[PDB]
């Protein structure tokens, strides 16, 4: 029996659809905090167990019978470690035999500040005494593409990534990889550096963006301080602008680049290209 946290999130939703191609709904257990948002999962045969992430006891009850657990990291970036602390201890007590975790590409060496909470979580895993696998996801192409409209309307794309190379991949790609790891054998104890088969600069993004839209789009490389202040300028939560600007700087440092091709070789086919993703904007 396999269990999965964050099943109601964008990545998890895909993990589940992916898993359901080869796994009977019943053999899947979605540990969610709010079953109200688990409408779809219920309408598929998937088991849903409620568990407050800040509640180890509830997490332990929720992990009963679970042989393999996918810990889709928490989106509550800021108090994530304590949450994953609870989850890992619940698993130990419940007797989970295998845990796969979504971390960050090259976590231990990444220049991005987002690596922090993941590193703490990777340590706890090392400490758990439970066999585990690190699914170090690189950047979701859908992140930058979230600013596709703003760049199309206002004419240009901005950031602080310089010439850094982002080997992005879709959420569906990473979810498939997570799906294989938790369902198929031969993927325990591994440290997978998952990323796109290709990489691209923010400028290649603008050029690709103008090539398909027709309208012009230039890339304006700003400094970190600039970029940050730039987001809040159009009214953006400080935390966000900060993290966002830090990540771009982490990318300018090559922290989002990897060319191991672990992702495609793992999902058994080529990862989704930026060209195809960009295409969706005009689906
Ligand atoms: N490598 C990369 O490029 C990126 C990595 N990420 C991170 O990767 C993970 C996956 O992505 P995605 O689906 O897009 O993110 P989402 O925000 O869509 O998914 C978040 C999930 O974690 C759960 N969760 C968060 N807080 C709690 C809590 N206190 N108790 C129980 N569950 C909680 C569920 O929340 P709910 O019910 O509210 O849906 C939710 O499904 C995320 O958790 C996120 O932190 C995010 C963007 C980019
Ligand atoms: Cu497509």
Curated annotation (Swiss-Prot):
The EC number(s) attached to this protein equal: 1.6.5.2
Q: Which InterPro entries match?
A: NAD(P)-bd_dom_sf, NmrA-like, NmrA-type_oxidoreductase
Reactions the enzyme catalyzes: a quinone + NADH + H(+) = a quinol + NAD(+); a quinone + NADPH + H(+) = a quinol + NADP(+)
Q: What class of enzyme is it?
A: oxidoreductase
Q: Which SUPFAM superfamilies match?
A: NAD(P)-binding Rossmann-fold domains
Q: Which UniProt keywords apply?
A: NADP, Oxidoreductase
**Residues engaged in binding NADP(+):** 6-11, 33, 73-75, 138-143, 171
Instruction: Write out the transmembrane intervals.
Output: none
Q: Which GO molecular function terms does the record list?
A: NADH:ubiquinone reductase (non-electrogenic) activity; NADPH dehydrogenase (quinone) activity; oxidoreductase activity, acting on NAD(P)H, quinone or similar compound as acceptor
- What does the function comment of this entry state? Quinone oxidoreductase that may play some additional role beyond quinone reduction. Potential redox sensor protein. Overexpression induces retardation of growth.
The UniProt family comment states: Belongs to the NmrA-type oxidoreductase family.
What is known about its subunit structure? Monomer.
State the protein's name.
Quinone oxidoreductase 2
- Give the organism, scientific name: Escherichia coli (strain K12)
